[PDB]
Symmetry: C6
Subunit: 89 residues, 6 copies
């Protein structure tokens, strides 16, 4: 299934991206990852069409609240890449 | 229930936002999250009217003590978004 | 009881603030919190008069050793705010 | 076996590097390491030819998503160096 | 007993300060603390005369290796301040 | 025994320093330490002659891959300093 990512500087902007993502399309929220430096990445899974719409809506909503750094979609992540992503853990 | 967020650079400014928030309106303090880089987000729950007043009072009080980065309100966060927020944990 | 906070960039300046605080007035040292980015906040509890004198003495002593970021006093923190502060833990 | 490394500022750019790496050549994804400051390093193992192609494809794909910091290949890491690398842990 | 502190940006400069401190005077190495942002503080205990000589020698040696941020001596730290310092833990 | 240290900004440059160190002279790799801010220090032990050659080779190799911050050698670290260094832990 497709992979969606919205990366922000600040947790507030992230939470906004998350909410806007799940509300906008039929994607499931995997959760958020923080790599320090105030960087937070929100991750969602679903069909490519859904994930694309969600990520667009997420980044849009996030820019209003804070600083958006990265936005990307992977229609079909390699299986090995799955194991470095959470299921919601 | 509504979601309120005040994000500051520095814990001191955050504590001020927190105190001012709960004192100003009938919101419950969920706690604070730190994503590194000195970024701290204070989270509260309550009715939209309460949360809005609290967050306004929080950011105002916080700017006097330190550096306010983000302030946002979500009147009704998606259920999936609930699980990435603490209850007070 | 009153709440006192001295926030510094660097642990050395913090330790100086701490020592100067407890020596200056009758406040109890709750400990120090670090939110990353080199930010360290020293926390004390006591009567408002004591905490005010301590924090003044703390920030003064700290500026000589390092970089002071924030200094604040809350004469009576809301009860909910208590649970996000340590007792000395 | 050869060692491949792609280091990015941001987790999103890293995930892109990872996916592009395993899809491009026959390398196994060891995982990613984060040393703070938003720095994330994706690690792969395989034959030198495979690892070289993967890392090229990884950095290329990553620059489109975010900020690439370092890209390196070690055809035969010393055995002692093995123990400071994960197996996928 | 007296308290000595040498704070550096980088672990290498810190290790140099530590070695130079214990070699220079009769102070016991409590260890080092890191508050993030690359800030590392080396802590020693002993008589004020010893600690003063050690810290001077520490900062001198450290500037040659890296970046020294803070250097301070507390001839007699308050007892409460003791509990926020390690014994070597 | 002698102590060798190579400090880099980024894990990739560090791994390169490590590999180049053990391959260049007869030093044992203690491991690497990260103090945040992307700072990583590679540590090796051996005879002073070996450690000196290793550290030279390490820093040289590391500058090609990334950013080298500090390079230092301690021919005979004080015993107390031993306990703040890993054995390979």
């Amino acid at each position: 299934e497709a992979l969606g990512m919205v990366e922000t500087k600040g947790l507030t902007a992230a939470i906004e991206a998350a909410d806007a993502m799940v509300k906008s399309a039929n994607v499931m929220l995997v959760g958020y990852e923080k790599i320090g430096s105030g960087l937070v990445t929100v991750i969602v899974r679903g069909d490519v069409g859904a994930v694309k719409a969600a990520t667009d809506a997420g980044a849009a909503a996030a820019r209003n609240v804070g600083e958006v750094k990265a936005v990307h979609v992977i229609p079909r992540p390699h299986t090995d890449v799955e194991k470095i992503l959470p299921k919601g853990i």
